Structure 1
């Protein structure tokens, strides 16, 4: 019931792809050699600017039918501007001493690789991706 991982990620390049609404993002962990990520996001909901540093966070929680926020008393889980929900398509190891996690969020896909995370990360269908400006 706590966040699996948090980082500051600086993106060098965003590729629009064939789609206009959805662009892919190629970022790396800032000051860390170990973590690099490529993630599909929608620019209309939140516009990724080139050379932005954006806070990335993955959280397990915070079946059940989705409920619209019943009132303002129900507190938003995140200050973060962007949140997605999705399921990992694969947990792999890039090379020995290098793990990679491939999470799919609504068909949008993100891959991020780094050793320390695999002890945090679990084969959980639940994941919340939290992007802060």
Structure 2
């Protein structure tokens, strides 16, 4: 029920596409020049500028009918700025010992490549995305 991935990416290219409140962001890992990702981001809620540095995280938890946060009684599992929920729909074997995971947050897509997360990411409905400032 704990974290399944953690890394820091620096933004390379933001592209609004034909959209008005969503941009397709393309970034790569920092201090690790082999693993990159692509994501769809609501810029209206949490803006995203070029060459920013965003702390990315994936969790398996923290089925049941969602209920609004009643009060501060609910202890958040996040001091981040941006959180989404998605579902894994493809695990692409890029090459020998190089894998890619495909996520969709109700339409907003995510593509992540590299092979230092093999033991954690899974073909599981549960997937929480988290971005920090």
Which interval holds the TM-score relative to the shorter structure? over 0.9
CA contact (8 A) 1:34 1:114 kept: yes
Cα RMSD for the two superposed structures = 0.8
Given that residues 34 and 115 in structure 1 are in contact (C-alpha distance below 8 angstroms), is that contact kept between their aligned partners in structure 2? no
TM-score, length-normalised on structure 1? 0.97
Contact 2:89 2:123 (8 Å CA) reproduced = no
1:33 Cα deviation after fit: 2.0
Q: Shift in Å at residue 96 of structure 1? A: 1.1
Deviation per CA, 1:86-123, whole angstroms, max 9, x where unpaired?
10120111111210000111110000101121211111
Other-structure match for 1:83: 83
* Aligned residue-pair number: 133
Displacement of 1:34: 2.6
How many Å separate the matches in 1 of 2:33 and 2:109?
22
The alpha-carbon deviation at position 50 of structure 1 amounts to 1.0
**Structure 2 runs not aligned, ≥5 long:** none
SS at structure 1 position matched to 2:64: coil
- Matches of 1:109 and 1:62, distance apart in 2: 21
Q: Deviations over 1:55-98 (max 9, x none)?
A: 00000101211100011111111001000001012011111121
- The runs of at least 4 consecutive aligned structure 1 residues that moved more than 3 Å come to none
Q: Is the 8 A contact 1:5 1:57 kept in 2?
A: yes
Q: State the SS of the aligned residue for 2:11.
A: strand
TM-score when normalising by structure 2 = 0.97
After superposition, residues 64-83 of structure 1 pair within 5 angstroms as 64-83=64-83
